[PDB]
Structure 1
Amino acid sequence: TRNGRDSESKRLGVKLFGGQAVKAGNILVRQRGTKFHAGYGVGLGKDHTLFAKVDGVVKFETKGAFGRKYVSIVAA
């Protein structure tokens, strides 16, 4: 055999779902690339990480051309 290799899992995915309360600096989604784009109140890390910039509630809206999926923070 010449096959027995793999790599450690990176624990990617959504960390806070729709309706959850958020704080500034809270990480929302971990990605490779951007499945989700930064909406209102959210910022983008250098490894394509979505983090909250204000306090509120996750929205998870898809809108606009290109059919993009957006994560935004709204009023509580």
Structure 2
Amino acid sequence: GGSTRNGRDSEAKRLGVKRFGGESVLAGSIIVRQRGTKFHAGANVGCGRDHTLFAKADGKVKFEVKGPKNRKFISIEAE
């Protein structure tokens, strides 16, 4: 009674954990809702509407911490 329902999939997480093939624009992190769980940085950025961490130019993924008070900050150099 009045108890049930539920959203659905909405994966939103790391799909390009650490270094990877890193194509012109994979994802490496689609953890929506977030902006601080994974901050836009490095050769890549994007951070689309749903905050999905873009991932520009091809290369390797990094996953840093640089910046006052934690602050993840995903960056991707060239591999």
Tell whether the structures are fold-level matches, with TM greater than 0.5: yes
Question: How large is the RMSD of aligned CA atoms in angstroms?
Answer: 1.2
* Counterpart mapping for 1:6-45 below 5 A: 6-30=6-30, 31-34=32-35, 35-42=37-44, 43-45=46-48
* 1:29 alignment partner, SS class: coil
After superposing on structure 2, the runs of 4+ consecutive aligned residues of structure 1 that deviate more than 4 Å are: none
Q: Number of paired residues?
A: 76
In structure 2, list runs of 5 or more residues that go unmatched: none
Q: Which structure has the larger Rg over C-alpha atoms?
A: 1
Match of 2:69 among 48, 53, 66: 66
* 1:73 alignment partner, SS class: coil
Once the two structures are superposed, what CA deviation does each residue of 1:16-54 show, in whole Å capped at 9, x if it has no partner?
011212011212211212210011122210110111110
Identity among equivalent pairs (%)? 32
Cα drift, residue 56 of structure 1? 0.5
Question: Which protein has the bigger strand share?
Answer: 1
In structure 1, list runs of 5 or more residues that go unmatched: none
TM-score w.r.t. the length of structure 2 is 0.85
TM-score w.r.t. the length of structure 1 is 0.88
